[PDB]
Chains A and B, each alone.
With several copies, the nearest count.
Chain A
């Protein structure tokens, strides 16, 4: 910044700002910040709207900090405004904060926080990192149980390396960019795997397929790895829980992207006279949201009556004692899409 005295043109140089484009999407990563960082105050959540706004905060860029190489790889891939929260006060600020859809362990250990923070009632989907050491087929039972089995988290193992950085780059940095770059392009219901990594990011450790056969079962660890045709890409779409209800992240992330957009679609119903004309104004405010989600290919099926259902009413879902307690119970069902993980190729030699 130069002071301006005369009206005209100023030719002042500024070497190597490493400038990225501003982006707009609907995915807001709370970034965990280690306590030894100085340009953060605790019990406070500062907001970073673009890479120039982070670079205004820290002053100048250095590739030593585990946070500085983290938010560069975030804004190089997906962008979108992010919240930088220090770790020791992250349990107070995330329930405070609205616009929180995914909590990113930048380079820190959040496994004690996610157990109390991520709940079925909330709307978060945390992501954190695998081990930064190499792990083999033999150590498949040890590092798998180092994480909890909640269906609201995803683990990406191979830490990144880039030519512009010195410390290894943690993969939950880039995977919050990938979650925000895929939701804009292909929507939420498509899997955030099988997509390229921009910004010159490269995996540290080469992963074989026979290694990934043991980290996909149970408490799964998704992995990124480079291929010959396209380069480095994400190659996992499994959450930690291995029940069929929440096995894939696109199922868990759609139901979390539905609820945050239902509860703002029918937030007019608060403190309204609780009778019947409030109810059909509620079942119709949900039903032409889900139909607009139905036509874009977000739910599976072929009709609108195999796709979803909204059923409310006195006696259908709520009792008379629930009316004078001030409760409107709503039952909504969905049928999302599942991705195709495996493709097998049968090679007959004799053509008929």
Chain B
């Protein structure tokens, strides 16, 4: 007979309830995926036999976060339209698994300097019951994972 306060400290947390904060805005997305922390490896072997392994260069980070379109809201396009030649207004993304209503955060992922590439417009077909869903694949650096 476990109580509801032991569940909140022992049991793991599910993916289906999270909030995303793009810069200073809160945009409700459908699926955020593709954030990770990768490194490459350097090997060095010599003669008598010493297999030295060191982690080397930090590898790039591009996350892919997906949203249905809405009749008035055009938010992801004016970020992929804002880019002239060399610079975008880079924002920071905070993802955080929440409570049922968004009154508590449970674990938070912070993304440092994010600029968008590859906005994909929806796939129209007259035989599908889907919602018109678009995605944005923004490249960034330094995903950190913060408790509470």
Whether A and B touch directly in their complex, counting CB atoms under 8 A apart, is answered as: yes
A331 is an interface residue with CB less than 8 A from chain B: no
Q: In whole angstroms, what is the CA distance A292 to B102 when docked?
A: 29
Please state if A295 and B49 are interface contacts (CB–CB under 8 Å): yes
- Of A276, A277, A283, A288, which is within 8 A of B142 by CB? A288
Secondary structure of the B contact surface, majority rule: strand
A285 is an interface residue with CB less than 8 A from chain B: yes
Please state if B94 and A280 are interface contacts (CB–CB under 8 Å): yes
Q: A284-B94, A295-B49 are in contact. Are A277 and B112 (CB under 8 A)?
A: no
Please state if B110 and A277 are interface contacts (CB–CB under 8 Å): no
Q: Which residues of A contact B94 (CB under 8 A)?
A: 280-281, 284
Q: In whole angstroms, what is the CA distance A284 to B19 when docked?
A: 15
Interface residues of A in 253-296 (CB under 8 A from B): 268, 275-277, 280-281, 283-285, 287-288, 291-292, 295
Q: Which residues of A contact B92 (CB under 8 A)?
A: 284-285, 288
B88 is an interface residue with CB less than 8 A from chain A: no
Number of A-B contacts (CB under 8 A): 38
Q: Mark B95-124, 1 if CB is under 8 A from A, else 0.
A: 010100011110010101000000000000
Q: A285-B92, A288-B92, A288-B112 are in contact. Are A280 and B105 (CB under 8 A)?
A: yes
Q: Which residues of A contact B24 (CB under 8 A)?
A: 268
Q: Which residues of B contact A284 (CB under 8 A)?
A: 92, 94, 108, 110, 146
B21 is an interface residue with CB less than 8 A from chain A: yes
Least CB distance from B105 to A in Å reads 5
Least CB distance from A268 to B in Å reads 4
Residue tally, chain A, CB below 8 Å to B: 15
Residue of A nearest to B103 (CB): A275
Please state if A288 and B96 are interface contacts (CB–CB under 8 Å): no
Q: Which residues of B contact A291 (CB under 8 A)?
A: 112, 142
Residue tally, chain B, CB below 8 Å to A: 19
Least CB distance from A289 to B in Å reads 10
Q: In whole angstroms, what is the CA distance A285 to B93 when docked?
A: 10
Q: A277-B103, A281-B21, A295-B49 are in contact. Are A287 and B96 (CB under 8 A)?
A: no
Q: In whole angstroms, what is the CA distance A287 to B21 when docked?
A: 16
- Of B19, B49, B50, B146, which is within 8 A of A277 by CB? B19
Q: Which residues of B contact A277 (CB under 8 A)?
A: 19, 96, 98, 102-105
Q: Mark B1-41, 1 if CB is under 8 A from A, else 0.
A: 00000000000000000010100100000000000000000
B85 is an interface residue with CB less than 8 A from chain A: no
Q: Which residues of B contact A276 (CB under 8 A)?
A: 103-105
B126 is an interface residue with CB less than 8 A from chain A: no
Q: Which residues of B contact A285 (CB under 8 A)?
A: 92
Please state if A280 and B96 are interface contacts (CB–CB under 8 Å): yes
B148 is an interface residue with CB less than 8 A from chain A: yes
Q: Mark A288-325, 1 if CB is under 8 A from B, else 0.
A: 10011001000000000000000001000000000000
Q: Which residues of B contact A287 (CB under 8 A)?
A: 110
Q: Which residues of A contact B104 (CB under 8 A)?
A: 276-277
Least CB distance from B135 to A in Å reads 24
Residue of B nearest to A268 (CB): B24
Least CB distance from A332 to B in Å reads 16
Least CB distance from B112 to A in Å reads 5
Q: Which residues of B contact A295 (CB under 8 A)?
A: 49-50
Q: Which residues of B contact A280 (CB under 8 A)?
A: 94, 96, 105, 108, 146, 148
Q: In whole angstroms, what is the CA distance A283 to B146 when docked?
A: 10
Least CB distance from B69 to A in Å reads 25
Q: Which residues of B contact A283 (CB under 8 A)?
A: 146
Q: In whole angstroms, what is the CA distance A288 to B112 when docked?
A: 7
Least CB distance from B113 to A in Å reads 8
Q: In whole angstroms, what is the CA distance A313 to B147 when docked?
A: 12
Q: In whole angstroms, what is the CA distance A245 to B71 when docked?
A: 57
8 contacts between A and B (CB under 8 A): A276-B103, A277-B98, A277-B105, A280-B148, A285-B92, A288-B110, A291-B142, A292-B112
Q: What 6 new A-B contacts, CB under 8 Å, besides A268-B24, A285-B92, A288-B110?
A: A276-B104, A280-B94, A280-B108, A287-B110, A288-B142, A291-B112
B residues adjacent to A (C-beta < 8 A): 19, 21, 24, 49-50, 92, 94, 96, 98, 102-105, 108, 110, 112, 142, 146, 148
